Amino acid sequence: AYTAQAYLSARRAHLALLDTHGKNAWLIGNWHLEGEVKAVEKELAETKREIDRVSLAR
Amino acid sequence: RRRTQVMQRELPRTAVVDIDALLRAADEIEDPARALVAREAALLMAHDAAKYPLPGAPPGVKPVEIPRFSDDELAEARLQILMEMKEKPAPEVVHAIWNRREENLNALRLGLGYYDSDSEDGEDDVANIRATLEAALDRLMASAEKGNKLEKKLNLHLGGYKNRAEMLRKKLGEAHAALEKARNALAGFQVL
Amino acid sequence: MLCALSGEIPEEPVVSKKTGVLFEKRLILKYLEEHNNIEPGTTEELDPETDLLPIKTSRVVRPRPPNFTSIPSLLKAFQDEWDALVLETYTTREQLARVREELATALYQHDAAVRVIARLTRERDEAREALARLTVTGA
Amino acid sequence: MLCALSGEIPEEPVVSKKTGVLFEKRLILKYLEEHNNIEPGTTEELDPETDLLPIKTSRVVRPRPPNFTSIPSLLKAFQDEWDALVLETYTTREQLARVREELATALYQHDAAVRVIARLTRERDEAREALARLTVTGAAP
Amino acid sequence: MLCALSGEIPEEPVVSKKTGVLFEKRLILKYLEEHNNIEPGTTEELDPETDLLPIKTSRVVRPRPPNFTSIPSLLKAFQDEWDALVLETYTTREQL
Amino acid sequence: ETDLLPIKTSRVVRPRPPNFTSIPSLLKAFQDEWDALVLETYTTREQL
Questions:
Q1: Which of C59, C105, C110 shows the shortest C-beta gap to B180?
Q2: Alpha-carbon span A10 to E71, nearest angstrom
Q3: Residue E15 DSSP code
Q4: How far apart, in whole angstroms, are the C-alpha atoms of residue F33 and residue F27?
Q5: Using a CB-CB distance cutoff of 8 angstroms, which residues of chain E are in contact with residue D75?
Q6: What sequence ranges are listed for the domain U-box (chain C) (predicted)?
Q7: A8, A22, A48 member nearest B143 (Cβ)
C-alpha cells in the first residue's frame, strides 16, 4: 500500500507538471518534428530534381 | 509570544488535541514532576490549538489562562538545566543508536508511530498495523481517484495533439522510405 | 535543435569551427557581410569559406522521432527521475537526521529539566513546611 | 569508494577540495542548483568549477550475474530495484514524519518543563521571602 | 538536425571536420574503437580527438504523454520498445 | 604535504556493494546494450 501510494503521488506530480507545461512541450516537440520532416522532404525533393536532370540529359 | 512555542514552530504535532484526556493521563503519572510537566504540556497543546488552529482542526477551541512569567526566570531555569546537564553524546553515538534501532526493529516498524518499545503484545501491534493499512488504503484510493480524474482531463485536452504528432511521425516515416527509394532510383538512373 | 541567431530549425545549418555554434546559412552569411565576418558575442573573426562547415544528416538509420516513448528518451527520463528521487531522499534523510539530533538534545534537556523540577519541587515543599512550622510556632 | 549523496560508487565521481567527500557530478550540480550553491552536509559554498575536482582512474568492472543475461530477467531485476527504492523512500518519509512528531512532543514537554521550573522558582522565592520575614519578625532564642 | 548514428536528436552532438555528419559522441567513440578510428559509411579515417567537433546548443525536450506518467507505465513502454527494436533488428537481418 | 588531498567518507547512506542490481549500473548496461544494438542495426542498414 505504501509503494502504491508513492506511485500515485509520483503520478499526481507528473500530471501536475504536465498540466503546467503541456502546451510548451507539445509545441516544441511539434516544431522539432515538423522541422525534421521538412528537412527530409527537402532532401527527397533535391534527389528527385537531380534524377530528373540526369533523365533529361540522357 | 504568550502562546505555545510549538504553535509558532514548524512540524505541528496534532491538529486535534484533547486537553481533558491528556490531563487525566497526566494525573495518572506516578512521578510528580513528570505529572506537572505533562499537565503543563497538555495545557500548552490546548492553548496552541485554540490560538493557532491547524488546517482540518475544528475552530472555537477554548483557550486556557496561565500566569505571567518573566524572561529572567526562564533564563535562570535554562541556566540551571544547563548546569545540571551532563556531557552531550556525540553525533556518531546517536547515529549508532539510530542504526541499532533500525537494525533490531524493522524499518517499516520504526516508520510506524504505533510501534512502541513497551508494546510487546502481538495483538496490539496487529491491530495498529491493520488500522494503518486501512488508512493507507483509503488514502491510496483517494489519490487514485484524483489521478484518474486528472489523467482523464489531460487526455481530453491533449488527444488532438497526440493524434497530430502520430500522423506527422507516420508521414515522416513514409517520406523517409520514399527518399530511400528515390535515392536508389537516382543511382540506378545515373548508372543506366 | 534551434539556430543561435534565427531561433528556429535551420534548413541549411552550418557550424563554426572555432565556437561550435550552429547557424542558418543565409543569416550567418548576411551577418558576416555586415559584421566583417565576426561571430555574434565574440571578438574572433570567422572565415566564411573556411571556419564554416555544413552539417549533413544521412538517412541510413531509421529516423526515430524525438518522443518521450523513445528508448533513449525513456532511459534519460528514468535517469532523471532516479536522480530527483535520490536528491529528495537525501534531503529527507538530512532533515530526519537533524530532527533526530534535535530530539535527542531535547530529550537530554528534558531529563535535566525534570531533575531540576523535582529538586525545585522538593525545595518548595521543604520551604512551605518550614513556613507552616514557623507560622504554627509563631503565636 | 562510494558517493556520499547516493551511497554507491559513482561512474564519474568528483571530490570537493574542502572536505574531500566524493560525490557524483550531476547529482552535486542538481543539489547546488536546488539549494542555491550549498554543499551537501555543510553550509559552506563550494564552486563545482573550482572546488570540485574529477578523479582519473580505471573503471571498476562490475561482475554481471548470470541471471542478467536476458531482457526479461534484467527488466524484472530493474523493476524490483525500483520498487525497493520507492519503498525505501516512502519509509524514509514516514520515519522523518514520525521523528518530527516525536521531536515536537519532546519540545512541548521541554517548554512545559521550563514553564513549570519558572513557576516553581517563583513559588520557592516567595516561600523563602515569607520564611525570611517570619524569621526577622520572630525572636530567635 | 539529427544524429546519423542513432536516428534521433543527439544529446551531445559531434560532427566530423571533413564529413560533417552529426552523431552522438558516445556512439562515435564506440564506432571508432570498433573500427580502428574510421568514419562509418566512408573510407576516410576519422580522428575522435581532433577531427570531431562537439556542438554547443540547447537540449531538445520530448513532450511527456499523459499515459506515460507512471513508473510501471514507463517500464511497460521500455519493454515494448525493446521488443520492437529486437523485432526490427530480426526483420532487418531477414530482409538483408 | 600540499599537492595531495585526503578523501573523507560520509556514512549518511548505507553501504551499497557494486553489484549488478544497482539502478545506475542497470541504466548504464541498458544504454550500452542500446548502443550495441544501434551499431549492429546501422551496419545491417548500410549492408541492406
A1: C59
A2: 8
A3: E
A4: 10
A5: 75, 78-79, 82
A6: 1-85
A7: A8
Chains E and A contact (Cβ–Cβ under 8 Å for 3 or more pairs): yes
In the numeric block, the cell 504568550 is attached to B2
CA angle B173, B174, B180 (to 5 degrees): 90
Q: Which residue of F has its CA nearest to D80?
A: F21
Residue from C97, C126, C95, C121 nearest D122 by CA: C121
Single-letter amino acid code for the residue at F8: K
- Name every chain E residue with its beta carbon within 8 A of the beta carbon of A29: 61-63
Chain CA centroid to CA B161, Å: 37
Other beta carbons within 10 angstroms of residue B1's beta carbon come to 5
Q: φ, ψ for residue C9 (rounded to 5)?
A: -75, 120
**CB contact at 8 A, F21 and D81:** yes
β-sheet with D13-16: strand ranges across? D22-24, D13-16, D52-54
- Chains touching D (3+ CB pairs < 8 Å): A, B, C, E, F
Contact A34, B173 (CB under 8 A): no
The β-bridge partners of D21 are F8
Q: Which of C114, C120, C122 to mutate to test the interface with B (most CBs of B within 10 A)?
A: C114
Chain E hits for B161, Cβ within 8 Å:
63
Distance of CA C11 to the CA centre of its chain: 35
Chain A contact present for B151, CB below 8 A: yes
Is the Cβ–Cβ distance between C71 and E8 less than 8 Å?
A: no
Q: Which residues in chain A (4-43) have CB-CB distances under 8 A to chain C?
A: 10, 29, 31-33, 35-36, 38-40, 42-43
Run of H or E residues at E13: strand E13-16
**Tell me, what amino acid is at C11?**
E
Which of E59, B153, C70, C83 lies closest to A22, judged by CA? B153
Method: cryo-EM
Q: Which residue intervals of chain B are DSSP H helices?
A: 5-8, 19-27, 32-51, 71-84, 91-104, 107-111, 122-191
Place of cell 546494450: F33
Alpha-helical runs (H) found in chain E: 25-34, 71-95
User: Which chains are adjacent to chain F, needing at least 3 Cβ pairs under 8 Å?
Assistant: C, D, E
Give the other-Cβ count within 10 Å of C137's Cβ. 9
The x, y and z cell numbers of residue E82, run together, are 525493446
Nearest partner of B47 among B24, B28, B66, judged by Cα: B66
